[PDB]
Amino acid sequence: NERLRALEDIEREIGAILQNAGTAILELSKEKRLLDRQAAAFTTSVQHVEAELSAQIRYLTQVATGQPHEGSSYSSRKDCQMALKRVDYARLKISDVARTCEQML
Amino acid sequence: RKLRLVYDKCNENCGGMDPIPVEQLIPYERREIVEVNKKLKQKNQQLKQIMDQLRNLIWDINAMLAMRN
């Protein structure tokens, strides 16, 4: 939920920062300079991805042979569909009763 | 007070055919009123059908709730 989305956003931001640092290093070392030293840090950012790789290497890996999270748990979804259907049926019955009452006048 | 008043009114109501011996002799225009009554009963039958539809819908809703959790 929260932690999974946070780690995903963190990995996405890490990839974006790595791409930006690579582009900046290319633009700096292409033409003209001490700032090019920070370009080396871009390579360090690449190592961060490797750490993420390590983070993916020594990750959960529950089975690594099948798919986890058994069951879509959509029984609740089906129950909600039935509830909405009952609500619609009640609305239809109420509309019929209202038409009958209006005809009574 | 109202009982005394209605008793006095019933007593003073003895006007015309005062004896009226049909009490011990118990047996052993009106067209407009009858037509109004017929129209009223027709409208009542219509409203009765409407209430029948309403209670059918109510029983249906009760059936839905029977399916509830």
Tell me which chain A residue has its CA closest to the CA of residue B64: A86
Instruction: Look up residue A3 and give its DSSP letter.
Output: H
Q: To 10 degrees, the CA torsion angle through B46, B52, B57, B62?
A: 160
Q: How was this structure determined?
A: cryo-EM
Q: Which of B61, B22, B7, B46 is nearest to A101 (CA)?
A: B46
Report long-range pairs for A25-28 (Cβ below 8 Å, ≥24 apart). Answer: none
- A24 with A62: CB under 8 angstroms? no
- A5 with A13: CB under 8 angstroms? no
Among B45, B48, B49, B54, the residue to mutate for chain A (most A Cβ within 10 A):
B54
Phi, psi of A69 (to 5 degrees): 60, 60
Q: Count of residues for chain A?
A: 105
3-state secondary structure A33-79: CCCHHHHHHHHHHHHHHHHHHHHHHCCCCCCCCCCCCCCCCCHHHHH
Tell me which chain B residue has its CA closest to the CA of residue A92: B57
- A85 with B67: CB under 8 angstroms? no
SS3 state at B24: coil
- Determine, for residues B61 and A93 on separate chains, whether the beta-carbon distance falls below 8 Å: yes
3-state helix, strand, coil in chain B (%, to 5): 75, 0, 25
Q: To 10 degrees, the CA torsion angle through B7, B9, B12, B13?
A: -110
Dig out the tokens for A62 from the structure.
Answer: 């529950």
Q: How far is B36 from chain A (nearest CA, A)?
A: 17
Q: How far apart are CA B52 and CA A66, in angstroms?
A: 59
